[PDB]
Design a protein around this nucleic acid. Structure first.
Ligand code: MG
Ligand code: MG
Ligand code: MG
Ligand code: MG
Ligand code: MG
Ligand code: MG
Ligand code: MG
Ligand code: MG
Ligand code: MG
Ligand code: MG
Ligand code: MG
Ligand code: MG
Lengths: 52, 41, 95, 327, 95, 137
RNA sequence: CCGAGCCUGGUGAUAGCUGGUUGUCCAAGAUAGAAUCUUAGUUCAACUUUAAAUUUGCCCACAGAACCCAAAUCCCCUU
RNA sequence: GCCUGUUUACCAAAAACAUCACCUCUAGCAUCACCAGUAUUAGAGGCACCGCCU
RNA sequence: UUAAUUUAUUAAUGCAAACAACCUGCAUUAAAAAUUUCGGUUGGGGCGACCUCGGAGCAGAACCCAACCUCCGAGCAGUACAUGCUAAGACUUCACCAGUCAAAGCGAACCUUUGAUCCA
């Protein structure tokens, strides 16, 4: 199944956004727009929010 | 103090950011190249 | 002692008025039972030599059970009141 | 009355008579856990995954079978061993390294005799398993798979996205339709060279496992009763679609002699009278001896091969019959 | 609601209304959209934008809320930096 | 307290007569060592799932045997179909094998006469049942 | 007058149920969707009544409204 | 249905309830019942006198 | 009663409290109880099935509708991680709740199946 995860910005900001990834799939690292920084920055998966 | 701590941490991370992005993209591309190499066998 | 607390807050009564209690104000939760508190010690001044405690005129922290059951009832010790402390201080300085 | 208990009652009243003294062993094997084989994805790092499984101590029973029988690689543990396979994970190439599937749901594929450059049909087989096994056979073979159920077709699409790469999946090499197998005989005829007809069955093990949509529930009595007619019609349609001299494999996940031998015999009769087409049942006794090490087979079955579940190898049930259309 | 309280004889306010709706003095009621904080990960950006909005109530909804609140909640409030100060009055309205 | 609660579990929550309790204690005092809860589970396994009654549970020292062994043999028999839980009427289609034939005998005769199966199959079933119990708990 | 006595009180219990609801005269006044532990009820809508503000409202001739492959309906210049 | 008895005062007197007989379970004991008793006792439940064949 | 909620009370234990008895408090397990409920559709009952949403029949030509009913599938999957932010004007499952579309603008790049409030 899929799990909702909290991608947390690697830019030092507290900005986090939620994505969906397969449980069997590896932890996610993804480029995403940082509104506070106003630039695309890397985000890393921190913790599993739920299992959907 | 909290505001300046946030500002300096953001500045440091921004300084590291382009290198990190380039390294991550290079890692993705090299993983793809390894996949094609495995396809070649 | 059982110490209880209202679940439901009582509305303020005022200055000279008395609070008006309703059915919901009789619902209590036990916040503590004092009997389950850790035991403390009683301060006493000895009057006669007693084994493993002291000799005479020395302030001693004894278990409340011993102080109230053996020392005080038998006269072997007296309460560490300011008056008793002063009297035994005068005894010490007169010896 | 749970449908699981109803299925147990029916199996006790029928398969006991069918199997005599082997019924207790079959019953305990069914009621115990199922042994899963690991079919490596030919579209991934097959050598690396095979080495990993061999480290996990599984052996490719398929590998040391074709030598005597005469690309598929399914690793299964030795007899008696109950070790589980690690859950499948995406590979380096971006596809799932292996599929954890019933090893018995692979003998129909290996018995169909997939020759290079042969057109392949999956008449109704759309739960995965056999379909993915057929796909992971060669890069020069065209296959079309059909099933009435849109949900099962979507399940096929999901597993194909997981295992088959986009390059192979998008091309005409794979053709996924959702029409009716019964009307397939009129949609096409004498078109396919190798056909696999995995009719809906009582799926005895899953019937005893899962209460949901159990075929033995009181609601689905009509479906369970019309199952023989549907199976005969589907097998006849497959024999019609296959070319003269072509090969079909009738497959079932049931122990029922009714659904195993009477189905093929009635299909032969109906398609030789209503259509005057002759079909010959090919022997698979060599197949039985080849795979005796990995599976336990019921010998009293006159036509076809029945892999029965055993505690040593809890791989059944699986009945498969190879049929060559002589006309 | 309570039309005549047992202690004062006054009409009472349904506090569920106060916890949920803002009354603009002209007679408009503002509210949030239901589900605006629920399962945002499965909602489209347009739907989320619609849900994040402050929304006016019907005439009949407004009448119901007016009945369910007392006149205290319908007074002029001159808050210091009220974000709704401009919205408290209607302009260029014909009938 | 341990002895008293064992006896009280045997009498109240298990409905054993005083004489039956004395007989159990006399035959196998390991019951006292065995913890509560586990003992109740063993007794209810004998009573409900196995369909055994107090006189038989006392006669054949069922409480002496280990719960793991009891389940290993009983579930094997049941899945083989040679053992059937008695119905609401307390009847079965086929008479069940006796508790002496199930638990008292060794594995050899147990698999040769009662189960009529193979030792290898029994070992595989035992490992499978161990996995099932571990996963359940 | 006991599947749970009798009396008093809480008590003017509660009743989406039944029954009843008293001068004269005039006027406007009709079947209708949704939700509901809901279909013996209710709330919203529709209709209805009163008062008020304002300007268009109804009818409709053309023109116009889909491919797959009938009767009519919608819409609105005039009138 | 063993029997004599009992029961729905006011539509049922019975095959129902009780009953001797038997069985099962519980209890090792004092100053308010049981009981001023003590296992041949006491309390509870079942069954149906009895007698035979297994 | 193997419906839900309790264990105030007794009875056992356990831990504290008072120095074994007795007693207080807090727990756990029981006994005895106590309080409360009985969704909807289908001549009734048994066994059912269904209850929300979406697609098709089922409505020939705006909409709405043949409820009851027939078949199918969804409680998602894949993709992207601007698949962002804002904002005129509109639609709407005949109420509301909810649900849709969207110009212009800003910013990055250069989409195809459900559930409110409270409470955490
Ligand atoms: Mg005052
Ligand atoms: Mg009277
Ligand atoms: Mg009244
Ligand atoms: Mg009139
Ligand atoms: Mg409700
Ligand atoms: Mg009603
Ligand atoms: Mg008589
Ligand atoms: Mg008489
Ligand atoms: Mg009478
Ligand atoms: Mg009479
Ligand atoms: Mg429809
Ligand atoms: Mg609308």
């Amino acid at each position: 199944k899929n799990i909702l995860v909290r991608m947390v910005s690697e830019a030092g900001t507290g900005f986090c956004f939620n994505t969906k990834r397969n449980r069997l799939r590896e932890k996610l690292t993804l480029l995403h727009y940082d509104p506070v920084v106003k630039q695309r920055v890397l985000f890393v998966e921190k913790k599993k929010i739920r299992s959907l | 103090q909290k505001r300046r701590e946030r500002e300096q941490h953001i500045a440091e991370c921004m300084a590291k950011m382009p290198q990190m992005i380039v390294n991550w993209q290079q890692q993705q591309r090299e993983n793809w190249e390894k996949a094609q190499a495995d396809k070649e066998r | 002692t059982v110490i209880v607390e209202r679940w439901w807050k009582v509305p303020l009564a005022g200055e000279g008025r008395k609070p008006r209690l309703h059915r919901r104000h009789r619902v209590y939760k036990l916040v503590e039972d004092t009997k389950h508190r850790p035991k403390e010690n009683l301060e006493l001044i000895l009057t006669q030599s007693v084994e493993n405690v002291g000799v005479r005129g020395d302030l001693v922290s004894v278990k409340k059970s011993l102080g109230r059951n053996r020392l005080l009832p038998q006269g072997l010790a007296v309460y560490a009141s300011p008056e008793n402390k002063k009297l035994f201080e005068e005894e010490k300085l007169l010896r | 009355f749970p449908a699981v208990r109803l299925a147990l009652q029916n199996f006790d009243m029928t398969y006991s008579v069918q199997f005599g003294d082997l019924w207790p062993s079959i019953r305990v094997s069914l009621l115990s856990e199922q042994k899963y084989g690991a079919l490596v994805n030919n579209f991934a790092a097959w050598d690396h995954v095979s080495a990993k499984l061999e480290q996990l101590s599984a052996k490719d029973f398929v590998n040391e079978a074709i030598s005597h029988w005469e690309n598929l690689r399914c690793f299964t543990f030795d007899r008696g061993d109950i070790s589980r396979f690690p859950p499948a994970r995406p590979g380096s190439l971006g596809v799932m390294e292996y599929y954890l599937m019933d090893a018995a749901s692979l003998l129909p594929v290996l018995a169909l005799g997939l020759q290079p450059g042969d057109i392949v049909l999956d008449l109704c087989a759309a739960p995965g398993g056999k379909t993915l096994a057929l796909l992971q056979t060669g890069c020069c073979r065209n296959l079309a798979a059909n099933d009435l159920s849109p949900s099962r077709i979507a399940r096929l699409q999901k597993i194909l996205h997981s295992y088959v790469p986009e390059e192979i999946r998008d091309g005409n090499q794979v053709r996924v339709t959702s029409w009716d197998g019964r009307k397939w005989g009129e949609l096409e005829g004498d078109t396919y060279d190798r056909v696999l007809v995995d009719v809906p069955c009582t799926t005895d093990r899953h019937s005893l496992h899962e209460e949901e949509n159990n075929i033995f529930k009181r609601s689905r009595k009509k479906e369970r009763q019309i199952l023989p007619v549907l199976q005969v019609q589907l097998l006849a349609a497959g024999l019609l679609a296959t070319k003269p001299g072509g090969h079909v494999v009738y497959s079932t996940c049931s122990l029922s002699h009714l659904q195993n031998e009477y189905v093929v015999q009635g299909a032969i009769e109906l398609l030789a009278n209503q259509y005057s087409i002759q079909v010959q049942v090919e022997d698979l006794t060599h197949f039985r001896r080849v795979f005796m090490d990995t599976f336990c087979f019921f010998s009293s079955c006159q036509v076809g091969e029945l892999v029965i579940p055993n505690l040593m190898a809890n791989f059944g049930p699986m009945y498969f019959c190879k049929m060559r259309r002589l006309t | 609601l309570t039309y005549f309280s047992a202690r004062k004889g006054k009409r009472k306010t349904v506090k569920a209304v106060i916890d949920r709706f803002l009354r603009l003095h002209c007679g408009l009621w503002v509210r949030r959209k239901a589900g605006y904080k629920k399962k945002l990960w499965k909602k489209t950006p347009a739907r989320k934008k619609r849900l994040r909005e402050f929304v006016f109530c019907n005439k009949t909804q407004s009448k119901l809320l007016d009945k369910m609140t007392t006149s205290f909640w319908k007074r002029r409030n001159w808050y210091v930096d009220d974000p709704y100060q401009k919205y408290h009055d209607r302009t260029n309205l014909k009938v | 307290q341990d002895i008293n609660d064992t006896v009280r579990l045997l009498k109240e929550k298990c409905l054993f007569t005083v004489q039956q309790v004395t007989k159990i204690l006399h035959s196998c005092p390991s019951v006292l060592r065995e913890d509560l809860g586990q003992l109740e589970y063993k007794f209810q396994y004998a009573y409900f799932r196995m369909g055994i009654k107090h006189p038989d549970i006392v006669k054949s020292e069922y409480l002496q045997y280990s719960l793991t062994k009891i389940k290993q043999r009983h579930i094997y028999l049941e899945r083989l179909g040679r053992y059937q839980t008695p119905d609401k009427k307390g009847q079965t289609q086929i008479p069940n094998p006796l508790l002496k034939d199930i638990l008292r005998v060794s594995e050899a005769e147990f698999l040769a006469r009662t189960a009529c199966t193979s030792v290898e199959e029994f070992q595989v079933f035992k490992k499978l049942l161990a996995r099932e119990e571990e996963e359940s708990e």
